[PDB]
């Protein structure tokens, strides 16, 4: 006894109007901006079943020759990692007579497609950050669950994921985190599998005929939306997480973000990648806490972009600020 399942006359009456037909200007009131989706690169899954990756793991030991002395041959042992992917789809349903009843069909589907696009962007950003294969096996693993641990004292050289996570100290149900990532072919990028195209794939399935439990066939117009996307952490030494940032102590003057940021930059790897964009991924609370006044922004066409030590600070609305406490691998 409801009216929210499929699109009804009320919705088209409320969107398609203006003393006429459908509007080409539907304002996205729920449009959480996630510039992670724009900075992140994509790459076709050439391998075929799970994006593969070869990482150097051992290094040969060169030698100095002493008056015609032999140099033993050297190996170079290599590790290899597989990055599975995941797919999201969606389906529009409008009664064909309803679509025809509105003066326009292309626009009344275009705005409904923009709605689905925004929804997919939001869900994909959320799962890109907090996407876990541990609990949702149908979800490609995001940035967080690959780092839900930390070493007490960092190793001399990065040899584990836990060696790239800084424990900011904290507890409760108000902690947050910060991500410093470099987006690159050899660092990290999106993955659209083979055959499947890159990014969102709007598909307009013309007009079709439906059914019910008792005949009742009626004509519906169905728009199929799909987006496949996998996440790969190449050279994970390019990703550092600052976990357990208590937002309560952050709003007050108990912890300073600049110390955490400098520690993270210390724990990052020096940018040498060519063509690789890099950025900071921190929620609005962090940049609010950046109200501490020489670290300064930088000239890019005079834009609302902080440039912490030559690194853009992209504030992402998807970074939820009530994470779970990150344990320590003692």
């Amino acid at each position: 006894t409801l009216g929210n399942t499929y699109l009804t006359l009320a919705d088209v009456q409320k969107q398609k109007d203006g003393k006429g037909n459908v509007t080409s200007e539907i304002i996205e009131m729920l449009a959480e901006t996630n510039p992670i989706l724009e900075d992140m690169v994509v790459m076709e899954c050439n391998d075929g079943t799970g994006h593969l990756t070869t990482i150097r793991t051992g290094l040969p030991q060169a030698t100095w020759r002493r008056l015609y002395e032999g140099v033993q041959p050297a190996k170079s042992t290599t590790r290899q990692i597989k990055d599975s992917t995941g797919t999201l789809e969606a389906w529009s349903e409008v009664d064909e007579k309803l679509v025809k009843l509105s003066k326009d069909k292309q626009q009344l589907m275009l705005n409904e497609a923009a709605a689905f696009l925004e929804g997919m962007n939001q869900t994909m950003a959320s799962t890109l950050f907090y996407g876990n294969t541990a609990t949702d096996a149908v979800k490609f693993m995001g940035l967080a669950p690959r780092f839900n641990a930390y070493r007490a004292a960092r190793n001399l050289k990065p040899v584990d994921t836990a060696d790239q996570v800084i424990d900011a100290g904290g507890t409760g149900s108000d902690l947050t985190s910060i991500w410093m990532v470099v987006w690159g072919d050899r660092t990290a990028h999106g993955l659209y599998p083979e055959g499947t195209s890159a990014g969102l794939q709007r598909e307009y399935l013309g007009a079709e005929t439906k059914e019910l439990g008792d005949g009742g066939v009626y004509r519906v117009v169905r728009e199929k939306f799909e987006w496949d996307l996998g996440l790969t952490v190449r050279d994970f030494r390019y990703v550092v997480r600052i976990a357990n940032i208590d937002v309560s102590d952050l709003q007050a003057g108990t912890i300073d973000i600049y110390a955490l940021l400098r520690k993270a930059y210390y724990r990052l790897e020096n940018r040498v990648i060519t063509g690789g964009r890099a950025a900071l991924y921190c929620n609005a609370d962090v940049t609010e806490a950046m109200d501490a006044a020489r670290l300064t922004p930088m000239q890019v066409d005079g834009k609302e972009v902080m440039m912490y030590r030559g690194i853009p600070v992209r504030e992402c609305d998807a970074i939820l600020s009530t994470e779970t406490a990150v344990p320590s691998v003692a």
Partner: protein, 129 residues
């Protein structure tokens, strides 16, 4: 991962007690599918276990809907509850060899449990690190 509905043994099944799998994958012909090109599988534990003690996770295969006489193709052993967290795999990577007619997963538990779930089933490609 793109793990799908049909060839999937259990979806978030609690098996808190000493239960067995629900979706018994049945094949009319003894293909013994592991041969040749591999097929990835998971018995990854999907949500933590609270008060169990062992989770023997046999991969029993038999020749009848009801497993009157079953055959083991992969057993995890008496895994203590201290490891039954999320992502704790309980068998080999790819499909084993010897899947005669039917396939169901056993979940012999030493004592009962108040929490625990698994997602055993076939996966197109594994997820690692």
């Amino acid at each position: 991962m793109i793990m799908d509905k049909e060839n999937t043994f259990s979806y978030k099944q609690a098996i808190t007690g000493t239960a067995v799998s629900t979706n018994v994958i049945d094949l009319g012909v003894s293909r013994d599918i592991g041969k040749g090109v591999p097929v990835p599988i998971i018995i990854q534990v999907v949500e933590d276990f609270a008060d169990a003690t062992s989770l023997t996770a046999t991969l029993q295969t038999s020749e009848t809907e009801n497993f009157s006489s079953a055959t083991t193709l992969a057993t995890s052993g008496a895994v203590p509850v201290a490891d039954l967290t999320a992502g704790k795999q309980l068998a080999v990577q790819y499909m084993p060899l010897g899947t005669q007619r039917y396939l169901r997963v056993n979940y012999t538990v030493s004592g009962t449990a108040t929490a625990g779930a698994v997602t055993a089933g076939v996966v197109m490609s594994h997820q690692q690190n």
